[PDB]
mmCIF file of C-alpha atoms in Angstrom:
data_model
loop_
_atom_site.group_PDB
_atom_site.id
_atom_site.type_symbol
_atom_site.label_atom_id
_atom_site.label_comp_id
_atom_site.label_asym_id
_atom_site.label_seq_id
_atom_site.Cartn_x
_atom_site.Cartn_y
_atom_site.Cartn_z
ATOM 1 C CA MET A 1 0.134 0.141 0.080
ATOM 2 C CA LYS A 2 1.830 3.397 -1.744
ATOM 3 C CA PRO A 3 0.845 6.543 -2.667
ATOM 4 C CA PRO A 4 0.558 6.586 -6.315
ATOM 5 C CA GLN A 5 3.134 9.026 -7.438
ATOM 6 C CA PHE A 6 6.256 6.553 -6.236
ATOM 7 C CA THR A 7 7.692 3.525 -7.388
ATOM 8 C CA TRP A 8 7.662 0.671 -5.105
ATOM 9 C CA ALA A 9 11.459 1.454 -4.920
ATOM 10 C CA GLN A 10 10.699 5.287 -4.127
ATOM 11 C CA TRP A 11 8.214 3.976 -1.602
ATOM 12 C CA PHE A 12 10.959 1.321 -0.062
ATOM 13 C CA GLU A 13 13.549 4.365 0.086
ATOM 14 C CA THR A 14 10.777 6.636 1.793
ATOM 15 C CA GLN A 15 9.869 3.546 4.202
ATOM 16 C CA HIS A 16 13.203 2.264 5.297
ATOM 17 C CA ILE A 17 16.140 4.380 3.734
ATOM 18 C CA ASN A 18 15.150 8.083 4.326
ATOM 19 C CA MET A 19 14.603 8.366 8.250
ATOM 20 C CA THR A 20 13.644 12.269 8.378
ATOM 21 C CA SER A 21 14.123 12.560 12.175
ATOM 22 C CA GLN A 22 16.493 10.230 14.589
ATOM 23 C CA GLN A 23 13.349 10.299 16.325
ATOM 24 C CA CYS A 24 10.230 7.471 15.481
ATOM 25 C CA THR A 25 7.314 9.716 16.143
ATOM 26 C CA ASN A 26 8.698 12.532 13.755
ATOM 27 C CA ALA A 27 10.051 10.221 11.171
ATOM 28 C CA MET A 28 6.583 8.055 10.944
ATOM 29 C CA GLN A 29 4.725 11.308 9.972
ATOM 30 C CA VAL A 30 6.328 10.943 7.020
ATOM 31 C CA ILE A 31 4.670 7.165 6.394
ATOM 32 C CA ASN A 32 1.790 7.895 7.881
ATOM 33 C CA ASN A 33 1.099 11.201 6.116
ATOM 34 C CA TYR A 34 1.397 9.628 2.693
ATOM 35 C CA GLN A 35 -0.702 6.206 3.670
ATOM 36 C CA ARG A 36 -3.428 8.016 5.435
ATOM 37 C CA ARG A 37 -3.209 5.716 8.709
ATOM 38 C CA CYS A 38 -0.677 5.134 11.218
ATOM 39 C CA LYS A 39 1.706 2.425 10.302
ATOM 40 C CA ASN A 40 1.736 -0.134 13.419
ATOM 41 C CA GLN A 41 5.321 -0.810 13.012
ATOM 42 C CA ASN A 42 8.505 0.131 10.573
ATOM 43 C CA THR A 43 11.805 -0.291 10.452
ATOM 44 C CA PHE A 44 14.352 2.477 9.442
ATOM 45 C CA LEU A 45 17.802 0.860 8.415
ATOM 46 C CA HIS A 46 20.779 3.178 8.636
ATOM 47 C CA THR A 47 22.038 2.379 5.239
ATOM 48 C CA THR A 48 22.251 3.918 1.958
ATOM 49 C CA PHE A 49 19.794 3.357 -1.064
ATOM 50 C CA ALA A 50 23.145 2.334 -3.034
ATOM 51 C CA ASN A 51 24.204 -0.358 -0.223
ATOM 52 C CA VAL A 52 20.660 -2.007 -0.715
ATOM 53 C CA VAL A 53 20.824 -1.841 -4.446
ATOM 54 C CA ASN A 54 24.148 -3.948 -4.216
ATOM 55 C CA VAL A 55 22.495 -6.425 -1.420
ATOM 56 C CA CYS A 56 19.911 -7.289 -4.483
ATOM 57 C CA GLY A 57 22.814 -8.893 -6.137
ATOM 58 C CA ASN A 58 23.537 -11.013 -3.779
ATOM 59 C CA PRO A 59 22.297 -14.502 -4.154
ATOM 60 C CA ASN A 60 18.249 -15.173 -4.710
ATOM 61 C CA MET A 61 16.878 -16.564 -1.524
ATOM 62 C CA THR A 62 13.301 -17.431 -0.526
ATOM 63 C CA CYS A 63 11.533 -14.602 1.583
ATOM 64 C CA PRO A 64 10.826 -15.764 4.901
ATOM 65 C CA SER A 65 7.410 -13.431 4.656
ATOM 66 C CA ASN A 66 6.242 -15.730 1.253
ATOM 67 C CA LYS A 67 7.644 -19.171 0.855
ATOM 68 C CA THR A 68 6.624 -18.763 -2.915
ATOM 69 C CA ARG A 69 8.812 -16.056 -3.950
ATOM 70 C CA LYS A 70 12.200 -16.116 -4.967
ATOM 71 C CA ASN A 71 13.402 -12.502 -5.197
ATOM 72 C CA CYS A 72 14.731 -11.809 -1.656
ATOM 73 C CA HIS A 73 18.608 -11.497 -0.912
ATOM 74 C CA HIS A 74 20.229 -11.217 2.602
ATOM 75 C CA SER A 75 22.351 -8.313 3.899
ATOM 76 C CA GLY A 76 25.444 -10.081 4.286
ATOM 77 C CA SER A 77 26.437 -7.661 6.869
ATOM 78 C CA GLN A 78 24.657 -6.210 10.169
ATOM 79 C CA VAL A 79 23.614 -2.658 9.806
ATOM 80 C CA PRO A 80 22.270 0.026 12.476
ATOM 81 C CA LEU A 81 18.590 0.053 12.763
ATOM 82 C CA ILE A 82 15.754 1.669 14.430
ATOM 83 C CA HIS A 83 12.464 0.292 14.533
ATOM 84 C CA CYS A 84 9.257 1.997 15.870
ATOM 85 C CA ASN A 85 6.269 0.909 17.217
ATOM 86 C CA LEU A 86 3.460 2.708 17.763
ATOM 87 C CA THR A 87 2.055 3.317 21.208
ATOM 88 C CA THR A 88 -0.632 5.706 21.256
ATOM 89 C CA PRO A 89 -3.533 5.223 17.775
ATOM 90 C CA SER A 90 -5.153 8.277 16.429
ATOM 91 C CA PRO A 91 -6.790 7.142 13.544
ATOM 92 C CA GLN A 92 -8.895 10.618 13.227
ATOM 93 C CA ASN A 93 -5.724 12.726 13.893
ATOM 94 C CA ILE A 94 -2.929 11.144 12.684
ATOM 95 C CA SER A 95 -0.410 13.277 13.485
ATOM 96 C CA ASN A 96 -0.954 12.553 17.060
ATOM 97 C CA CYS A 97 0.079 9.079 16.627
ATOM 98 C CA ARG A 98 3.174 8.630 19.214
ATOM 99 C CA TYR A 99 5.849 5.611 18.770
ATOM 100 C CA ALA A 100 8.436 4.249 20.562
ATOM 101 C CA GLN A 101 11.997 3.752 19.252
ATOM 102 C CA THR A 102 14.462 0.486 19.517
ATOM 103 C CA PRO A 103 17.670 0.909 18.492
ATOM 104 C CA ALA A 104 19.553 -2.334 17.247
ATOM 105 C CA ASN A 105 22.327 -4.062 15.022
ATOM 106 C CA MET A 106 20.883 -6.373 12.539
ATOM 107 C CA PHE A 107 21.128 -8.219 9.149
ATOM 108 C CA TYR A 108 17.685 -7.741 6.757
ATOM 109 C CA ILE A 109 16.368 -9.517 4.011
ATOM 110 C CA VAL A 110 14.771 -7.371 1.112
ATOM 111 C CA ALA A 111 12.868 -8.340 -1.754
ATOM 112 C CA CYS A 112 13.951 -6.884 -5.253
ATOM 113 C CA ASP A 113 12.629 -6.580 -8.877
ATOM 114 C CA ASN A 114 13.437 -4.800 -12.308
ATOM 115 C CA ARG A 115 12.700 -1.169 -11.945
ATOM 116 C CA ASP A 116 9.731 0.578 -13.347
ATOM 117 C CA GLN A 117 10.395 1.111 -16.401
ATOM 118 C CA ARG A 118 8.384 4.805 -16.892
ATOM 119 C CA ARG A 119 9.423 5.894 -13.674
ATOM 120 C CA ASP A 120 12.407 4.799 -12.031
ATOM 121 C CA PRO A 121 15.809 6.055 -13.287
ATOM 122 C CA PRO A 122 17.977 3.875 -14.864
ATOM 123 C CA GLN A 123 21.023 4.181 -12.985
ATOM 124 C CA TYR A 124 19.629 1.190 -11.211
ATOM 125 C CA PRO A 125 17.963 -1.579 -13.070
ATOM 126 C CA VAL A 126 17.462 -3.923 -9.985
ATOM 127 C CA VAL A 127 15.817 -2.093 -7.178
ATOM 128 C CA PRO A 128 14.671 -2.853 -3.534
ATOM 129 C CA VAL A 129 10.660 -2.956 -3.433
ATOM 130 C CA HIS A 130 10.027 -4.649 0.124
ATOM 131 C CA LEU A 131 11.614 -5.390 3.547
ATOM 132 C CA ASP A 132 10.846 -8.931 4.138
ATOM 133 C CA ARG A 133 12.779 -9.463 7.345
ATOM 134 C CA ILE A 134 15.334 -8.434 10.110
ATOM 135 C CA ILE A 135 17.544 -10.974 11.976
#
């Protein structure tokens, strides 16, 4: 579930790469204001989009979240990350949603696909499209 102006890769970047504040309540405003709902949980990876693209080059493996998909890739190394958990739902005023933040250093598994032909930049033929799991 993403706003229509973003490709899957651009939405992946918005949700998981471009944390706009180190504090979850503030950073989550971006995701929530775009998807018109307070997301119950979300992981921000302190890594770069280029680094994730390179993870897409690691061997294909089964996606933990969907046993039938084989477009997943393991990060190889751990990264610092911040996991945000909703503490104070507010469906009629999403700016009032508050979150806890949990820091960790973990591996991740990402699903990757070929880029959106019309809208993703040709620089990256293969892009991350979903954060499948953190381990």
